[PDB]
Amino acid sequence: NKKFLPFQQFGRDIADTTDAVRDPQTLEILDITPCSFGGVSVITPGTNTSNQVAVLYQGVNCTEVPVAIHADQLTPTWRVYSTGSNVFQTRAGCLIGAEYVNNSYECDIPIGAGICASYQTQSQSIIAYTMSLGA
Amino acid sequence: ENSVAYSNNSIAIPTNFTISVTTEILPVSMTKTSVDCTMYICGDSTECSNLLLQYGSFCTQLKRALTGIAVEQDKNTQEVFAQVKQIYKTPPIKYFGGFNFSQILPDPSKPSKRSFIEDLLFNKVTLADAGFIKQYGDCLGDIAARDLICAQKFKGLTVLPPLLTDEMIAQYTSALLAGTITSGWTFGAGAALQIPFAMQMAYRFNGIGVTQNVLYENQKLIANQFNSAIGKIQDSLSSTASALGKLQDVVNHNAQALNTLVKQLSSKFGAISSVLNDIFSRLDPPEAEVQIDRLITGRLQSLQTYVTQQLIRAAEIRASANLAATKMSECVLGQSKRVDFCGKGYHLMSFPQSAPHGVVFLHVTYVPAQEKNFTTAPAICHDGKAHFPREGVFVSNGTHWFVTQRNFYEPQIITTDNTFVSGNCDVVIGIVNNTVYDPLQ
Amino acid sequence: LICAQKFKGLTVLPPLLTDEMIAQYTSALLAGTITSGWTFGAGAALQIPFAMQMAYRFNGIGVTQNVLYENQKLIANQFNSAIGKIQDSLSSTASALG
Amino acid sequence: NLLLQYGSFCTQLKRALTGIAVEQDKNTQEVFAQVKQIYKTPPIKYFGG
Amino acid sequence: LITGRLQSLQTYVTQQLIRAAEIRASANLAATKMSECVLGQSKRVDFCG
Ligand SMILES: *[C@@H]1O[C@H](CO)[C@@H](O[C@@H]2O[C@H](CO)[C@@H](O)[C@H](O)[C@H]2NC(C)=O)[C@H](O)[C@H]1NC(C)=O
Ligand SMILES: *[C@@H]1O[C@H](CO)[C@@H](O[C@@H]2O[C@H](CO)[C@@H](O)[C@H](O)[C@H]2NC(C)=O)[C@H](O)[C@H]1NC(C)=O
Ligand SMILES: *[C@@H]1O[C@H](CO)[C@@H](O[C@@H]2O[C@H](CO)[C@@H](O)[C@H](O)[C@H]2NC(C)=O)[C@H](O)[C@H]1NC(C)=O
Ligand SMILES: *[C@@H]1O[C@H](CO)[C@@H](O[C@@H]2O[C@H](CO)[C@@H](O)[C@H](O)[C@H]2NC(C)=O)[C@H](O)[C@H]1NC(C)=O
Ligand SMILES: *[C@@H]1O[C@H](CO)[C@@H](O[C@@H]2O[C@H](CO)[C@@H](O)[C@H](O)[C@H]2NC(C)=O)[C@H](O)[C@H]1NC(C)=O
Numbered sequence: 001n002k003k004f005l006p007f008q009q010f011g012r013d014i015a016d017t018t019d020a021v022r023d024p025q026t027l028e029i030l031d032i033t034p035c036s037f038g039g040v041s042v043i044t045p046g047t048n049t050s051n052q053v054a055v056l057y058q059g060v061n062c063t064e065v066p067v068a069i070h071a072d073q074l075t076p077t078w079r080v081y082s083t084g085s086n087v088f089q090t091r092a093g094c095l096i097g098a099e100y101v102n103n104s105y106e107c108d109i110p111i112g113a114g115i116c117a118s119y120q121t122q123s124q125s126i127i128a129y130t131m132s133l134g135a
Numbered sequence: 136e137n138s139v140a141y142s143n144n145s146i147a148i149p150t151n152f153t154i155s156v157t158t159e160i161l162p163v164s165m166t167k168t169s170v171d172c173t174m175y176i177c178g179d180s181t182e183c184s185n186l187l188l189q190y191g192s193f194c195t196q197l198k199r200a201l202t203g204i205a206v207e208q209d210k211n212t213q214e215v216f217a218q219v220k221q222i223y224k225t226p227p228i229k230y231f232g233g234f235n236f237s238q239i240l241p242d243p244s245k246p247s248k249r250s251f252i253e254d255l256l257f258n259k260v261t262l263a264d265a266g267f268i269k270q271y272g273d274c275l276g277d278i279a280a281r282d283l284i285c286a287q288k289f290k291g292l293t294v295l296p297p298l299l300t301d302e303m304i305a306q307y308t309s310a311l312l313a314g315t316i317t318s319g320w321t322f323g324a325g326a327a328l329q330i331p332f333a334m335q336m337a338y339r340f341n342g343i344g345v346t347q348n349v350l351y352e353n354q355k356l357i358a359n360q361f362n363s364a365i366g367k368i369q370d371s372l373s374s375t376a377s378a379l380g381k382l383q384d385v386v387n388h389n390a391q392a393l394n395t396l397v398k399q400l401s402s403k404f405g406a407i408s409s410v411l412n413d414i415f416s417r418l419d420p421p422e423a424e425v426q427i428d429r430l431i432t433g434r435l436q437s438l439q440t441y442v443t444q445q446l447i448r449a450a451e452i453r454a455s456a457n458l459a460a461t462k463m464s465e466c467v468l469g470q471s472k473r474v475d476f477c478g479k480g481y482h483l484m485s486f487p488q489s490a491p492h493g494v495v496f497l498h499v500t501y502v503p504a505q506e507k508n509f510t511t512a513p514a515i516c517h518d519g520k521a522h523f524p525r526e527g528v529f530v531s532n533g534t535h536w537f538v539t540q541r542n543f544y545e546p547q548i549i550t551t552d553n554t555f556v557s558g559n560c561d562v563v564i565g566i567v568n569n570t571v572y573d574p575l576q
Numbered sequence: 577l578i579c580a581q582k583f584k585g586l587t588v589l590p591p592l593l594t595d596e597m598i599a600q601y602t603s604a605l606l607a608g609t610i611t612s613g614w615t616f617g618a619g620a621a622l623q624i625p626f627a628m629q630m631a632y633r634f635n636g637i638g639v640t641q642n643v644l645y646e647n648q649k650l651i652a653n654q655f656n657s658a659i660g661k662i663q664d665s666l667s668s669t670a671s672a673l674g
Numbered sequence: 675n676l677l678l679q680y681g682s683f684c685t686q687l688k689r690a691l692t693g694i695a696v697e698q699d700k701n702t703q704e705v706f707a708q709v710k711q712i713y714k715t716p717p718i719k720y721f722g723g
Numbered sequence: 724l725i726t727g728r729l730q731s732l733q734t735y736v737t738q739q740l741i742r743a744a745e746i747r748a749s750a751n752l753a754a755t756k757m758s759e760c761v762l763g764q765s766k767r768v769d770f771c772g
């Protein structure tokens with residue numbers, strides 16, 4: 001919705017980044033935002049205990065990570081993690097590979113925003129739940 | 136300039152006392168951060184990475200140190216705010232010997248559990264952002280490139296949210312307040328034991344050398360003074376440009392460091408320019424690679440300097456965190472006899488409060504108000520034997536001699552049970568003549 | 577040497593507090609702790625005889641008051657000898673500042 | 675003229691070398707300024723021997 | 724020459740900033756000792772003398 005003066009070519013901002021450009025053909029204001037990028041973290045309960053893991057992404061809503069996985073062209077297990085088996089979105093990001101419950105107890109592996117991942121035994125799988133301060 | 140009328144047979148004793156309330160500000164933790172070496176140092180180009188791969192694995196130790204700092208801040212916060220193993224709940228009633236406590240107790244009416252003073256403190260302090268799920272997508276529209284955090288995310292610098300939320304910190308503070316108001320100080324040494332507030336007040340006055348009869352004969356006055364003081368401090372803390380500069384300093388320093396780091400990216404470093412594509416074009420590889428190497432070395436050195444400068448502040452932040460934990464443990468969970476530590480003057484108690492990236496204390500002190508001239512003597516000789524006060528000072532207004540306690544004028548009559556004799560009265564210096572009641576006879 | 581380092585842009589700024597004001601603060605603190613006991617730390621200073629303050633301090637560390645009032649001259653002599661000894665030691669020693 | 679191309683490192687260093695200066699006098703004032711008034715000894719000096 | 728001299732200046736300012744923190748810690752300890760052993764007797768053993 002931002003407007004430009006008639007002589008303005010392309011905008012900028014604080015810390016000298018190219019914010020917006022005006023198309024030469026039509027003279028319409030367009031905006032620029034880069035592709036999604038961020039770190040990747042892997043949660044594991046110990047190789048001796050088990051081998052299945054749950055992955056995580058930081059500061060990314062992951063309704064578009066299957067595209068990134070396909071572009072990466074990795075082994076099929078990476079494409080499996082791109083499927084919507086159990087996708088849970090948090091404040092830090094979204095979690096893939098572990099389901100979500102709401103019975104809360106002592107934390108084992110910190111994640112962020114008061115969420116911890118543990119390895120419950122009931123079949124065995126990685127579980128995610130909310131922090132519990134006590135009784 | 137003031138002078139003291141010092142005389143070897145003179146003394147002054149207060150009549151009033153006075154309650155007061157003072158605040159204290161202590162940072163507890165800073166903002167965690169992370170960096171993306173590859174995209175920052177060169178950019179979106181591909182050959183930059185190819186030329187970089189023959190360098191050292193510099194990003195490994197940088198990531199290791201940054202992760203260490205990030206986990207260290209969490210450890211500091213958990214250590215300072217998790218000194219109890221139970222979550223106590225206040226009783227439904229709010230009557231404690233006439234005192235006022237609505238200003239600090241949690242309010243169930245507000246959807247967010249945060250008391251009034253905490254509300255004022257949180258609103259006063261302005262942060263870079265409130266939430267953290269905000270991202271490039273949340274910048275869509277005119278918001279793009281309009282926020283400092285948004286531009287930092289543009290430049291490959293991300294911020295990891297703290298593990299503990301604000302609500303958990305508020306609950307911890309509320310539990311500490313409930314434990315220190317209902318169960319006294321005993322809940323820091325095992326299981327909490329309930330006890331009425333007045334008896335705890337009597338204990339605390341007995342701690343600083345005042346008999347409980349002072350409190351139990353003046354309770355309304357102390358209640359009114361405490362209530363007026365807490366109202367006054369509530370009104371005064373709002374003010375403007377208050378002591379919150381200590382908390383503001385950390386945010387200001389972090390913002391300045393990040394701004395300098397991001398703005399330093401656009402330096403030519405003595406090269407032809409500061410654009411990867413421009414250097415890639417208009418020049419053949421043999422000297423373009425030299426220019427790229429120079430630019431990469433300069434940028435990497437600047438990043439290393441930033442990492443070292445950021446690591447510097449962690450030590451002082453940890454020292455402040457340990458000091459805050461010490462103050463919590465030895466001011467809230469008990470009564471400290473070390474002077475000028477848990478406040479100014481004689482100390483009574485404290486109530487902690489939570490602030491963004493820090494902690495707030497509310498000390499409660501005790502100060503004498505109004506003194507009087509009196510004449511004193513070190514000892515008494517009635518039957519050729521020296522007499523000494525069991526505890527207190529021998530005083531007299533001019534006509535008769537009385538014995539009284541230290542920090543509160545309260546004359547009595549000298550009796551055999553209030554004094555103990557020792558030796559003869561021919562070796563002391565300033566003894567006088569008087570008699571002793573000896574109630575047995 | 578100072579002039580040599582000056583010509584390269586290296587400078588030293590004077591401290592805000594002159595030594596005279598530091599001496600004045602130290603004298604004020606010593607007076608407050610010598611004539612008013614420890615009361616002046618909390619609120620208004622109150623005059624009190626020095627001997628009674630000594631009795632206070634001995635009553636602090638598990639000793640009854642009658643110990644001091646029967647041995648005042650010995651205490652004075654020992655304190656004076658100690659202050660003379662520390663003055664002499666400080667005069668003789670020129671390396672303990674470290 | 676050439677130094678301007680290297681950036682604003684001079685501003686960074688000048689800012690850095692002022693925190694120390696304020697730190698020193700803050701430390702001194704905090705350590706010593708602990709009395710609200712300025713007392714002085716009485717004209718006579720006899721503290722019980 | 725410019726980059727070498729600037730790097731040397733960076734090292735020197737880093738060292739000064741290192742020493743400043745230790746000076747602060749010593750000053751804070753001195754202030755605490757002042758408060759706890761000049762304004763009143765301290766029951767802590769061997770803390771003062
Ligand atoms: C470019 O020249 C064309 C010549 O007609 C101008 O008209 C545009 O023509 C293109 C293709 O036929 C259309 O897609 C545009 O919608 C036309 N413009 C408008 C405003 O209707 C066009 O204006 C010129 N562009 C400039 C001067 O920026
Ligand atoms: C001790 O202090 C209290 C308050 O500082 C004095 O009480 C005041 O008494 C006057 C006259 O009765 C009232 O008008 C005031 O309202 C009282 N104060 C308050 C806060 O209500 C009291 O007089 C002092 N003690 C002595 C012995 O005078
Ligand atoms: C305890 O403090 C609260 C807070 O001031 C008092 O509630 C106030 O009551 C007055 C009159 O009833 C109202 O005008 C204010 O608006 C109230 N303040 C708030 C924040 O709600 C309460 O009366 C005090 N309790 C006692 C026993 O005095
Ligand atoms: C010092 O205090 C004593 C104790 O109150 C005073 O003695 C009393 O004075 C009142 C005043 O008329 C008499 O009614 C009492 O009978 C006195 N007590 C006795 C035991 O006789 C004394 O007056 C005070 N002195 C000064 C100078 O104020
Ligand atoms: C305290 O009282 C005693 C006893 O009344 C006084 O001792 C007498 O003082 C007179 C004064 O000259 C002497 O003549 C007597 O010989 C003393 N008696 C004894 C047994 O020694 C004493 O002087 C009084 N103290 C003061 C300071 O007046």
Ligand SMILES: *[C@@H]1O[C@H](CO)[C@@H](O)[C@H](O)[C@H]1NC(C)=O
Pocket residue numbers: 048049
């Ligand atoms: C895994 O558990 C086994 C069984 O005790 C133990 O010997 C091994 O050390 C564990 N793995 C690690 C990495 O400690």
Ligand SMILES: *[C@@H]1O[C@H](CO)[C@@H](O)[C@H](O)[C@H]1NC(C)=O
Pocket residue numbers: 061062063089268272273
């Ligand atoms: C991803 O989720 C966040 C919060 O749930 C939301 O603000 C954002 O719009 C979502 N992304 C897209 C592309 O809708």
Ligand SMILES: *[C@@H]1O[C@H](CO)[C@@H](O)[C@H](O)[C@H]1NC(C)=O
Pocket residue numbers: 101102103
């Ligand atoms: C867990 O699932 C939902 C999550 O919001 C919750 O409402 C529900 O009450 C929980 N399950 C049980 C059995 O309580």
Ligand SMILES: *[C@@H]1O[C@H](CO)[C@@H](O)[C@H](O)[C@H]1NC(C)=O
Pocket residue numbers: 143144564718
């Ligand atoms: C007490 O002070 C007065 C005057 O200051 C002095 O004359 C007297 O000698 C002193 N007392 C003693 C025991 O010396």
Ligand SMILES: *[C@@H]1O[C@H](CO)[C@@H](O)[C@H](O)[C@H]1NC(C)=O
Pocket residue numbers: 140147506507508
């Ligand atoms: C105590 O006596 C001194 C000596 O004259 C005097 O200056 C002071 O004002 C007196 N105290 C009070 C509370 O009046």
